[model samples]
Target chain A: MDKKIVGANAGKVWHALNEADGISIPELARKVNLSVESTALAVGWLARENKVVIERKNGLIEIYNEGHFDFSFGLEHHHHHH
Target chain B: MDKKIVGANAGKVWHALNEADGISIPELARKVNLSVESTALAVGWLARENKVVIERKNGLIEIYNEGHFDFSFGLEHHHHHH
Candidate 1:
């Protein structure tokens, strides 16, 4: 169950972004190092909070972080702080 | 096939929460002004982000906020949430 890796998967995505600002979602999933579904679940949170940026270029989907936005996830500290 | 709303339907659920806090999933769907399935989609996002707290008390699932998870839905600006 990805329930085990949800935040950890999200954490990896954040760090992957730190290593490289913009990347494709599929590539991010390969960096998925965890679970495909779980990574998406995390990406959804990222997109919704407007922390992550989604774009289209040359018919390709591009994902990136917003300029000057911080990566501190309340979801990170709050949920697992359990 | 996207219509009426953009981003995640979760944004509506978040907006509904700001209008009123601590509502059940079913009631939340109704207030979300979207289909139950659509609302559930939103609910999934919110919960994963720890924006909503789901607890089982006496066999009933209760949902609450951490008292500071901001979903505002752009009433004016994210700056004046107070």
Candidate 2:
């Protein structure tokens, strides 16, 4: 309910994302010792800042740091159009 | 993965909120026929629009429409300062 906690948890969640290629929200919540609700709030904060990427893989919701460019899905094709 | 789905889900979620005082993200997901991840994204969208309120209650993350003013916790105190 407090903005401070949400912002602080965002830091924790972001750090977790930096250490892994991708992780689910529940997985990240466990890693950061936060409730799923709080983790989602953190993710929402990171989302607002454009600091994370949310994707679906293997039927699970996964997240990656925005700085970690993933090219496994032929996304590399987009950059060569120029 | 698509902004359109996220936006469309937000509308479904907002409608769900209109029928209840509060509902958890997972609960909203079920009502809106979305995965939890997508539901969370919808929540993030609504959060950005300032159209919803996320709060912890009864050990669950519950959401309320911004128009649904709750004063059970003395929030009414703030409006009397004028």
Candidate 3:
């Protein structure tokens, strides 16, 4: 693959990841119109930087943007300050 | 793993590769004193950018810095251009 093309591919992957509720590698590849091989490389790039996170169970892999998780502190009297 | 540590590990790998003839991932990891998993991730970053190239056959993997290859042309005793 050309150097510039991989950058473009990864950019699209990042965009799609931001938009999707949750996605996996093969599915994301189709969504971004890149081959599975290329998608793996793209995911590798993002995963290394912690921009994306991977979840695995039953030998199936799922990917998500690191920002998608909302871990609340569970405050008893939580108030929204708008 | 801390983000800063991975960056430092990759930097060391790049420097070692420039110094050594050619090396494998696990050996490089040991040389750099990084855990294999972290070293793998560092290699992933360099491979993504084509700063390193991989050649695999017979189930063995070799890595090299981008500047190592010397593909000389055999021009039948051509004059030295240096």
Candidate 4:
């Protein structure tokens, strides 16, 4: 999985979550038009960005966007360090 | 995926990469005893930490540890922001 691809898919996932909150992994993957692996990686990117909230309830993964805000839609912000 | 789980798997992936030097996702997952999804998420965590190097060449994904160093295992260091 390329970082650029992961980051781009992250932007898509974030937008989907913003439009429809509390989505499951399968549903999110379908909505984002990405494979489960790609979508999971995107979720990982979102997790790192802290721009998504994930919870496991009843053995189901529920994902939600942290909030509506500006999210750099590409890989221009890789220096995510102090 | 859970952030704690991702971080923990990242630690595993890092160790495996350090030992094996360079590996593919599937091989790395086997070494770490994690699913491809879990391994990919862990890779995302490592990517965020800048502790891993991933390259796609000849239609194959190659993963390598950035180097030998202290990697904070678990979720004890989540406040990765300014």
Candidate 5:
């Protein structure tokens, strides 16, 4: 894949997950007009970077932010140092 | 369509979009081993949420963050509420 694609897709997913109050792969695909498989793959890379958290509940994957807001300050902020 | 899928994918896409610097649909697909179509769809949903921004340069798509960090405080922070 391309970095641009990953970056673009990742940005979209973050808002949908953290701000939009969460969504699903198929729903996301339908909303964006993509396939479920591609949605899953895009999410996989995001999870690996610790930007999002995935929880398995009742055979369902629930995704959320990993609280990386502190990283915006280069990981030296006292608020997050604790 | 499953909320879990969307949630999971969106979460992943967020990090990849912001913290990972940048990515493209093809490179992202190869890294995540997904189809380009799905990657595009996932990114589409994210863009609609105002999480990511896409720029076309030299026939290539470039994605970037939309500065939603202020939203973490419920859109009421003096810095963002302004």
Candidate 6:
């Protein structure tokens, strides 16, 4: 079977993760309007790739951030509180 | 500066996001042993892509998941609770 790679969708998922608090797979699927199975698979890839982190709490799986790498492609000057 | 593209590092970040709770940039950097500047940049990409979601709480930024996609490449049947 030819696997469908949703690179752009994956990017969207990553974006959402960066902008919100931890979320469960089902909740994330609801947010993105995707199926739980699909969300799980995509998250699995992200987890394997170390783009995000997952935790089991209250019988639900919560996902968060594992780490990030700085890219020197271009720097845009923006003043934001850290 | 040639701007190093840490594709692999990005992958690691994504994976970490998938396996843990929400995390801040500084905390994430500490976990990954990277500088806050670098983590911020990497997370910027992830945020732009929409792979993760970010939220402001108590003057601190928390990141989570946005969504996920399923690939039909392979089926690994493992019994795990949803």
Instruction: Give the candidate number with the greatest TM-score.
Output: 2
TM-score of each: 0.40, 0.73, 0.47, 0.61, 0.39, 0.38
Could you give the TM-score of chain B for each candidate, in order? Answer: 0.60, 0.72, 0.70, 0.74, 0.64, 0.67
Give candidate 5 misplaced runs (Cα > 4 Å): A1-82, B2-4, B68-82
Per-model TM-score of chain A alone?
0.60, 0.73, 0.68, 0.74, 0.61, 0.65
Model 3, B1-82: lDDT tens digits are: 3345446667888887889825776688789886444455566567655666655446465667878545433668768797
The CA lDDT of each predicted structure is: 0.54, 0.70, 0.61, 0.68, 0.53, 0.53
- lDDT string, candidate 1, B1-82, tens digits: 2222333676766766665565655577665566433454355467555675554455444455544455434353322221
Fnat by candidate, in order: 0.05, 0.18, 0.15, 0.54, 0.00, 0.00
Q: State the lDDT at A4 in candidate 2.
A: 63
Worst 10 residues of 3 chain A by lDDT: A73-82
lDDT of candidate 4 over A1-82, digit per residue (tens) = 5577667778987888878977776677888887665576677788788776656676566667777445646666567687
Error of 5 at B43 (Å): 1.1
CAPRI tier for the interface of model 2: acceptable
- Give the DockQ-based CAPRI class for model 3: incorrect
* Candidate 5 CAPRI level: incorrect
- Interface Cα RMSD per model, in Å? 7.0, 2.0, 5.3, 2.7, 9.5, 13.7
**TM-score of model 2 (CA atoms):** 0.73
Per-residue lDDT tens digits for candidate 2, residues B1-82, read 5456567778877776766637777767776787877777677777766677767766677777877564224233322100
Worst 10 residues of 2 chain A by lDDT: A71-80
RMSD of each: 13.0, 9.5, 12.3, 10.4, 16.5, 16.1
Overall local distance difference test of candidate 3: 0.61
Cα lDDT for residue A66, model 5?
A: 55
For model 3, residues A30-75, the per-residue Cα lDDT tens digits are 7677654456556657755566665544544566676666532223
lDDT over C-alpha atoms for residue A81 of model 3: 18
Q: In lDDT terms, which candidate is top?
A: 2
- Writing each residue's lDDT as its tens digit, candidate 6 over A1-82 gives 1123544456555555665636765666676665443454455446445676544456444667543343222132422221
lDDT of 5 by residue, A1-82 (tens): 2445756666655544544324556665554454454455456556546576544455444555655445322232221100
